[PDB]
Design a protein around this ligand. Structure first.
Ligand SMILES: NC(=O)c1ccc[n+]([C@@H]2O[C@H](COP(=O)([O-])OP(=O)(O)OC[C@H]3O[C@@H](n4cnc5c(N)ncnc54)[C@H](O)[C@@H]3O)[C@@H](O)[C@H]2O)c1
Ligand SMILES: NC(=O)c1ccc[n+]([C@@H]2O[C@H](COP(=O)([O-])OP(=O)(O)OC[C@H]3O[C@@H](n4cnc5c(N)ncnc54)[C@H](O)[C@@H]3O)[C@@H](O)[C@H]2O)c1
Ligand SMILES: O=c1ccn([C@@H]2O[C@H](COP(=O)(O)OP(=O)(O)O[C@H]3O[C@H](CO)[C@@H](O)[C@H](O)[C@H]3O)[C@@H](O)[C@H]2O)c(=O)[nH]1
Ligand SMILES: O=c1ccn([C@@H]2O[C@H](COP(=O)(O)OP(=O)(O)O[C@H]3O[C@H](CO)[C@@H](O)[C@H](O)[C@H]3O)[C@@H](O)[C@H]2O)c(=O)[nH]1
Ligand code: NA
Ligand code: NA
Ligand code: NA
Ligand code: NA
Lengths: 338, 338
């Protein structure tokens, strides 16, 4: 198929793109480069064994979107473009609502105009908000997310939902997940965060690499097996894979197809650290801190539906998430070149 | 003060504008005229005993907003601009999210740029969603509205809230209400709906006037005193008044000031019809229909807070809502001239 991948050069998008090309689809990447570099492009092409078209631009530019759409005869769109830093979202809420909410709106409005009706939304498990029932299942109603980031994701979920309802020929997937981790097995692509990493894994990696002194673990008194918080971590390759199957199987199947993507189990902070110490050959440094405010002791997603309906499940392990991450750090200590 | 009233030429805005001028503020009306006519302008000026500045334009035009802001040295903004037809919102959800959600976002983004930090949002009681606890109080958490219209209102409420939180010097009022009815006592301004009126009152009026044959009443079996649905109706003059006091008293008082504006009581469909038959001098024609889907038997807002905090309460009666409405119909059977 002909797919427009917004946010194509990002962490998730990059890996998705590689898997897309490998499956032989024609890929058009639309990215404003606000959080990625052109330098990943050639990597994608190489790893994908095929050339993707790149367009520098912004989802908020409805006119350009339309143009793209038409120009490339897009059949479907995978939308990864947006801001995703939670703390920053609390500080800069307007930028989050404009990039996520308005940005998707402008994107779908252009699809409407270009006659495109297959969409895959890279969503978020924050949409379940504060549900005490875990693991979370697609059949649980959503809750009220705590940051502007989370709120923005749900708002887009609702708008897409209403749209489909008004334009019932549309096929829209809402892919929910938590923590993408790892890197391509080649060690030639991976997460390249600028500044202090918000996510555990990359933080760990940086500490390990010697850029950070020690990991502060928020709380050691949860009602968890080891006392640290339990989260859901998904290898970026599996997630990319989930994105492709979803795209491929849902195309032209009218509806709002909601799926949680994850391993189906949780892993504690210590488990993540130990797996990491294991990958990098040395004990990761850490210390305890107090519960970070708004944290649940444990949380994870039930991924039965995706298994059943898309015949999709993860295949990478926590250890692999670690190795691969350390592998990319090790081969490209400076990340993507400028 | 210097006030920008977006949606200034609309039903609510027009009346608000008149009361603003009477209090001697300087008024700038920004309206795209999508649902109003320039012809109301001179009425406003006359009734207000003062000249308001009019700018034709769209809230979604961030650049123009900014310009206005600066140009007129705005101190505060009353935002009435948006789409508000529920049924249409289900049919055309994107237009609702773009006008309401993006439109407010662009508006507040321009305020940010122009350094304006006093805002009065003309909200909606739909935000309480399906609460079985009535009357609704500002202290009740919000629920999930049922249409894109309702959803859009809540989303804007949330964005404004987050913004204030990030920019704590802002003063933002979220004014919630239900059914504005009536017209200026002069009979020279009032609601001028194009097409089939969605609201009860105007529908009634049209039937009465001979444009409509009969009113269909949805359900006669509710757990209400007379069996018909109980709603909350507020005279447009009182509501306008609430908008002005809010503006005047809240200016520069940092926070998110939430207030329900209403009479504090509910009135049934029959009560509304009888008051109308009474105003127009003849029995309004009606018939019963089945419960319209998604309707509660009764619903109304508690307006104690506004009384207490702003010393505001309504002063017009249901009968007056009717008379005034019939009065405007009677003096301007064709509404505003083209
Ligand atoms: N990484 C996570 O922990 C996390 C968890 C939940 C959901 N997501 C979602 O997945 C998506 C992809 O995130 P990611 O992890 O790959 O982050 P990422 O920043 O690496 O990728 C996003 C890409 O989009 C681009 N972009 C941002 N705003 C844009 C705009 N207006 N127009 C065009 N391009 C724009 C950035 O340049 C970047 O390359 C986002 O929707 C994010 O909300 C990620
Ligand atoms: N009337 C009701 O029953 C109801 C109940 C709840 C809330 N409200 C809210 O009050 C506000 C005013 O509504 P109203 O009853 O006076 O309706 P209205 O349509 O008469 O007034 C709205 C005005 O805004 C203008 N407008 C619409 N979209 C615009 C945009 N993008 N840019 C600039 N101008 C634009 C229209 O031309 C119109 O004059 C809206 O926010 C509405 O959601 C009204
Ligand atoms: O320096 C750190 C970083 C994280 N943690 C812990 O590591 C676990 C995982 O933390 P984090 O990366 O923040 O995971 P999540 O809380 O699972 O947050 C992710 O999933 C959410 C859905 O609930 C989204 O809001 C976010 O964008 C996303 O990063 C948690 O128990 C944290 O307390 C630490 O102890 N120290
Ligand atoms: O032809 C008609 C029109 C209305 N009604 C009834 O009249 C009452 C009032 O109806 P309506 O004008 O639709 O009032 P609300 O249901 O109170 O809706 C208003 O308040 C809501 C907040 O819950 C918003 O979603 C809407 O924009 C707004 O018009 C209800 O019991 C209706 O069933 C009839 O019987 N026949
Ligand atoms: Na429809
Ligand atoms: Na670098
Ligand atoms: Na802040
Ligand atoms: Na007319």
């Amino acid at each position: 198929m002909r797919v427009l991948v917004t946010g194509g050069s990002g962490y998730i998008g990059s890996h998705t793109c590689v898997q897309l090309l490998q499956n032989g689809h024609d890929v058009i990447i639309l990215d404003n480069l606000c959080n990625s570099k052109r330098s990943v492009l050639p990597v994608i092409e190489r790893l994908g064994g095929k050339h993707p078209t790149f367009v520098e631009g912004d989802i908020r530019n409805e006119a350009l979107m339309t143009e793209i759409l038409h120009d490339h005869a897009i059949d479907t769109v995978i939308h990864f473009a947006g801001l995703k830093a939670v703390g920053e979202s609390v500080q800069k809420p307007l930028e989050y609502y404009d990039n996520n909410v308005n940005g998707t709106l402008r994107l779908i409005s252009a699809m409407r105009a270009a006659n495109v009706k297959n969409f895959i939304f890279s969503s978020s498990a924050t949409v379940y908000g504060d549900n005490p029932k875990i693991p979370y299942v697609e059949s649980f109603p959503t809750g009220t997310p705590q940051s502007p980031y989370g709120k923005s994701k749900l708002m887009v979920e609702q708008i897409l939902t209403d749209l489909q309802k008004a334009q019932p020929d549309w096929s829209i997937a809402l892919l929910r997940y938590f923590n993408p981790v790892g890197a391509h097995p080649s060690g030639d692509m991976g997460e390249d965060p600028q500044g202090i990493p918000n996510n555990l894994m990359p933080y760990i990696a940086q500490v390990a690499v010697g850029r950070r002194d020690s990991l502060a673990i928020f709380g050691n008194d949860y009602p968890t097996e080891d006392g640290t918080g339990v989260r859901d971590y998904i290898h970026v390759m599996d997630l990319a894979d989930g994105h492709v199957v979803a795209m491929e199987k849902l195309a032209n199947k009218p509806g709002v197809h909601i799926y949680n993507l994850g391993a189906g189990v949780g892993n504690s902070v210590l488990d993540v650290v130990n797996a990491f110490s294991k990958a990098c050959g040395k004990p990761v440094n850490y210390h305890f801190a107090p519960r970070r405010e708004g944290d649940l002791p444990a949380c994870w997603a039930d991924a039965s539906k995706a298994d059943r309906e898309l015949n999709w499940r993860v295949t990478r392990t926590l250890d692999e998430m670690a190795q691969d991450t350390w592998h990319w750090q090790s081969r490209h200590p400076q990340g993507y070149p400028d």
